[PDB]
Amino acid sequence: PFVEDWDLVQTLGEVQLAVNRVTEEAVAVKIVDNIKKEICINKMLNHENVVKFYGHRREIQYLFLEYCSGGELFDRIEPDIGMPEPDAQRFFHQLMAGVVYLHGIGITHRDIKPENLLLDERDNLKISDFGLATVFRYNNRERLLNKMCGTLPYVAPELLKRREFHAEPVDVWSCGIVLTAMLAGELPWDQPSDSCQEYSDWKEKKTYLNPWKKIDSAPLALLHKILVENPSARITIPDIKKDRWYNKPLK
Numbered sequence: 013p014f015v016e017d018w019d020l021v022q023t024l025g026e027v028q029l030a031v032n033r034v035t036e037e038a039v040a041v042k043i044v045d046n047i048k049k050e051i052c053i054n055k056m057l058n059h060e061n062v063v064k065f066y067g068h069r070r071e072i073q074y075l076f077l078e079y080c081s082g083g084e085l086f087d088r089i090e091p092d093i094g095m096p097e098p099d100a101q102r103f104f105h106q107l108m109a110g111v112v113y114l115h116g117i118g119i120t121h122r123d124i125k126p127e128n129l130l131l132d133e134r135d136n137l138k139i140s141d142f143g144l145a146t147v148f149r150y151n152n153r154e155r156l157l158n159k160m161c162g163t164l165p166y167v168a169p170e171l172l173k174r175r176e177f178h179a180e181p182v183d184v185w186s187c188g189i190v191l192t193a194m195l196a197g198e199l200p201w202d203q204p205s206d207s208c209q210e211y212s213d214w215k216e217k218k219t220y221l222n223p224w225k226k227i228d229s230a231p232l233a234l235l236h237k238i239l240v241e242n243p244s245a246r247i248t249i250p251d252i253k254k255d256r257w258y259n260k261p262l263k
């Protein structure tokens with residue numbers, strides 16, 4: 013099947029890979045039959061660590077998005093192992109870039125996870141899929157988020173325990189969990205709730221258990237600052253930049 017000039021070559025995720033018969037350019041195609049908001053949000057985005065939005069056309073609705081040859085960051089993680097520290101650090105820098113940007117235009121992704129961090133040919137990281145995204149700052153006014161979403165393992169504690177919560181710390185939490193899985197190749201908990209055994213152990217600082225033992229002490233220190241239950245004591249992105257591991261030379 014094809015749309016306009018573009019031919020849908022293969023299924024990517026629905027999302028197909030589209031190649032132009034004429035220009036031979038490859039793009040990502042989103043086929044939908046909250047979409048309006050996603051299209052609106054995509055237009056507002058212009059960063060090198062965020063998937064490009066080319067435009068949309070209704071028929072089924074069609075979102076035209078940058079194609080990342082690399083695929084998911086998820087594939088680059090090795091189970092129980094993770095990826096080499098220099099690699100994870102670079103990836104984590106590009107994620108901070110993309111997320112800083114969104115935050116500065118009042119946008120929160122709300123679903124950060126390795127499945128939604130795509131890699132281009134140069135292996136540059138792109139924040140992907142704004143179907144769950146929303147505005148948390150408009151006209152210089154911040155709006156707290158009440159709706160629950162994202163993926164349990166990457167979700168912040170306040171979101172399960174609070175009527176309303178700030179958007180930004182939630183994206184920082186998710187970024188920590190993503191850091192953890194890059195360095196450890198496994199996720200700490202099914203969910204951040206106290207009922208879960210793994211979360212409680214972390215709260216008590218039982219670092220000896222997995223996956224913390226697999227992680228070096230510099231990054232582990234950063235994660236001690238990121239996975240802080242108090243959304244208000246949690247470290248901010250501006251502070252993550254000053255983190256020693258973040259600025260440590262690697263490779």
Ligand SMILES: c1ccc(-c2cnc3cnc(-c4cn[nH]c4)cn23)cc1
Pocket residue numbers: 024025027040063077078079080081082083084130140141
């Ligand atoms: C596996 C391999 C490549 C991919 C892949 C490559 N390029 C893109 C662009 N967008 C998406 C996407 C997905 N949802 N919303 C947008 C996926 N992509 C995706 C999965």
